[PDB]
Amino acid sequence: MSETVICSSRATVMLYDDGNKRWLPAGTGPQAFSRVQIYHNPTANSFRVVGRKMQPDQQVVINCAIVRGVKYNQATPNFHQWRDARQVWGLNFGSKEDAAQFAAGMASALEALEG
16 A cells, blocks of 8 residues: 555645635635545655545645644644645644544654654
């Protein structure tokens, strides 16, 4: 299998546009939540998020890498916004378990990457 996934949460990934101060659908225009999973690649001691929509289309809404530099902010019980380089990946969740599970793996990444 492609690398070793960490966790999986239900949410509609969102990309912030500091240029205009607001959020913006990471993937394409349409929306309908997405199954985002984290990738645990210890071969290089690095992590990366990967999520796709929940429709026959199957499109990745998130595909970035996190390495001892991003720290989950968690705006609300059902939201996770982190600042990596210059962008912001604020994904909106649908259920408590989603936002809770998502941070589960992630938190592990930021912990095995930072120290």
